[PDB]
Amino acid sequence: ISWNGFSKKSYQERLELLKAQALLSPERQASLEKDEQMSVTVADQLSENVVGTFSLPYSLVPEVLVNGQEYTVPYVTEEPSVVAAASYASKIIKRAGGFTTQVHQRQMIGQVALYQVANPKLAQEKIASKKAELLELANQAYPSIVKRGGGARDLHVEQIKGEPDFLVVYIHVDTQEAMGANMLNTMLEALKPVLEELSQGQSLMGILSNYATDSLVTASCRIAFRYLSRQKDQGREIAEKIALASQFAQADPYRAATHNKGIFNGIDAILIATGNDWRAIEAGAHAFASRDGRYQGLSCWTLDLEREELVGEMTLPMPVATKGSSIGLNPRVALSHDLLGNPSARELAQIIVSIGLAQNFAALKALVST
Amino acid sequence: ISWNGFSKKSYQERLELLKAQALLSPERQASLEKDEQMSVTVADQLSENVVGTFSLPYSLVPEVLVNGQEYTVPYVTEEPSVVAAASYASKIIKRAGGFTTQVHQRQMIGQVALYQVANPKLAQEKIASKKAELLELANQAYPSIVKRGGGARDLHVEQIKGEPDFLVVYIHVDTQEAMGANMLNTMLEALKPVLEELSQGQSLMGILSNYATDSLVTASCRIAFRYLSRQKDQGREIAEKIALASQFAQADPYRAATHNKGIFNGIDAILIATGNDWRAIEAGAHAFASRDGRYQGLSCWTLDLEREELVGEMTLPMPVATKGSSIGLNPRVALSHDLLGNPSARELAQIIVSIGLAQNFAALKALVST
């Protein structure tokens, strides 16, 4: 059923159109129609010193085509035009064939930092030769994840120079559908004593890394000039300027911040809708943006002149989750996951990166157009 | 009146204690007591494709001492223990004298990117000699801010090399209590034609920069070892390990992301409470974290061994606002500003950076303790 006029329709009419799309079960549609909120009692369980609740808008971005599957995407944002722009971007890219996306890996990285290591090279050697035993020790400490087919998968050790020197042990862990912060905290605590013994050093801390390079996800889109503007040669102008806009963000940190901000107008909105920790996704992606020695734009837009196409691409660390307290307790979050056809964390991650690149597309097109 | 037991008190008892503190007017206390939310109708004005609203917890972090003034800080977070940790951090630092903070500048930066500039050096020369006229042209285009004592204050031009070369013009603008994105969009549009004429180039875009280096704010705290632990020599151990934790984050991007994530658990929570754009604050701070060539921790913790003190310090771009749509329309946001004694954007910024450093303190202390 057509989605056009959805923006101009009234709140009641939007709800009836959504109902007509038959995306939600009777209970979820009713829940949405009485705008069921998470209660103070439930809020009081999630957080501390709770004295009430706080509301933001809940919107829909329809027609998000990811790998030939269409989604109606939920957004939570307080910013005017963020949703309109994501919706507009999404429709264009759908006409153009939607997004093509891949998950390169899905693992969480945990680290233990050791210091007062007399012989870092010898220590590094011992720990790395004891790798399989150490992985077994982490997996025994958290047997709940091995039974579900995940667990600790790899281990490496780095000498990091400085004031003072640190010997850092990284574990790589399949956490399946979970974020993994508690899991990795427990696994890493089990390893501390043996790591101290083997290194003859003191363990400083054992903690998940929000720099999730074992969970990179890339999205691309391929947009023919005729979808950018029907007027003759105007599509090429627009695409040219978007490519220049992309180059500008590679060149100037002052542009790149803003460029990457716009991407996260979309990303944080759906992360909130899905009960995901946006602080974590923000940190990893913004760290990723500075990996080649300077802070740069997270996406790139280039031209295919023979095919007459605008190409957009983006890789982000996206260790999102489909289970967790907020997902279990906030009834709108459960609704959001149902609305999305209950994607696995992998599929959700591919939708989120796509949303990011859509949001970016509308931002650049608006900025560079007369 | 004492705040202890506030965490363990019931939701009703917390509200009665808050009432006893007399921090809110009768209307605001009543508004909070019936948990007045922003309505769907109001939500529908803020955002697009609105089909409902979305709720998160609303909590209090009491006893935040900033420059000898105590605040009860509002938080909006879905993460267990974030509030408890901020509250715990805040009480310790209050005993220790609270935070000392300063605003170095408060200005917004806008940029126009020019390309196809044949002679960038000549163009740079012309624009810079025409500086005062250009500033006047921006101020005429937005007279609403000059009457309130703000406006365009400075202009500079940079040659940024790459593929291709860009000539970028930056304006620096006092936007008073406002974020300034609309203001700077309008001012920069007024400048485009003349900038093109003077440079003999094409303007790509005119846009606010979320890399807000003209709005840096620093907070510090000075914590005696005896406040970290009453046991003999245990305070020194803890402080030593926090300093090492700080060094770890300077050395390893994998730690720094997580380190900076924790800071923003606090910052984003109060930014939501106050109707502020957290995507913008995230982008600028995370870009700031990579300014010295590598992605590093945003705060530093060092020891004063003679004075027996743990010192924490943090500088962040904090161009927050005290006016704007969300602030005008979401009744809990208005409440949050009233709760805080209606601080100016400058004072709010100093509270937010302090909150960040408090959140960081509890994170590090927990990670490095037995």
Ligand code: NA
């Ligand atoms: Na309406």
Ligand code: NA
């Ligand atoms: Na209606």
Ligand code: NA
């Ligand atoms: Na919390």
Ligand code: NA
């Ligand atoms: Na509590």
Ligand code: NA
């Ligand atoms: Na309440």
Ligand code: NA
């Ligand atoms: Na929304």
Ligand code: NA
């Ligand atoms: Na995983």
Ligand code: NA
């Ligand atoms: Na970490």
Ligand code: NA
């Ligand atoms: Na993460």
Ligand code: NA
């Ligand atoms: Na990770």
Ligand code: NA
């Ligand atoms: Na990866």
Ligand code: NA
């Ligand atoms: Na992934």
Ligand code: NA
């Ligand atoms: Na591709």
Ligand code: NA
């Ligand atoms: Na750009």
Ligand code: NA
């Ligand atoms: Na951002």
Ligand code: NA
């Ligand atoms: Na953008």
